[PDB]
Copies of this chain bind each other. A is one copy, B any other.
Amino acid sequence: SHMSRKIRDLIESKRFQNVITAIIVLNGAVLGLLTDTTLSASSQNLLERVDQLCLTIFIVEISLKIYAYGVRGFFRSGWNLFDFVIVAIALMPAQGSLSVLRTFRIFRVMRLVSVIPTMRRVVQGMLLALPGVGSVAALLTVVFYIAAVMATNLYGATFPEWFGDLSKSLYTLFQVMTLESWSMGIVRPVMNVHPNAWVFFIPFIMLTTLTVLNLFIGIIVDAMAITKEQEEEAKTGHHQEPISQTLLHLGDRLDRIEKQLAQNNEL
For chain A, the count of residues having a C-beta within 8 Å of the partner chain is 86
A67: interface (CB < 8 Å) = no
- Beta-carbon contacts of A95-137 to B below 8 Å, as 1s and 0s? 0000110001011011011001011011100100000001110
A181: interface (CB < 8 Å) = yes
A260: interface (CB < 8 Å) = yes
- Pick from B31, B37, B139, B260: contact of A266, CB under 8 Å: B260
The answer for the CA separation of A106 and B150 in the assembled complex, in Å, is 7
Chain B's closest residue to A107 (CB) is B146
The answer for the CA separation of A266 and B156 in the assembled complex, in Å, is 86
Q: By the criterion CB–CB under 8 Å, are A220 and B214 in contact?
A: yes
A32: interface (CB < 8 Å) = yes
The answer for the CA separation of A265 and B264 in the assembled complex, in Å, is 10
- Beta-carbon contacts of A169-189 to B below 8 Å, as 1s and 0s? 001101100111111110000
A166: interface (CB < 8 Å) = yes
- Taking CB atoms and an 8 Å cut-off, the chain A residues in 20-46 that contact chain B are 28, 31-32, 35-37
The answer for the CA separation of A60 and B117 in the assembled complex, in Å, is 50
- CB contacts (< 8 Å) of A100 on chain B: these are 196
List the interface of chain A (C-beta within 8 A of B).
28, 31-32, 35-37, 99-100, 104, 106-107, 109-110, 112-113, 116, 118-119, 121-123, 126, 134-136, 138-139, 142, 145-146, 149-150, 152-153, 156-157, 165-166, 171-172, 174-175, 178-185, 196, 198-199, 202, 205, 209-210, 213-214, 216-220, 223-224, 240, 243-244, 246-247, 249-251, 253-258, 260-262, 264-266
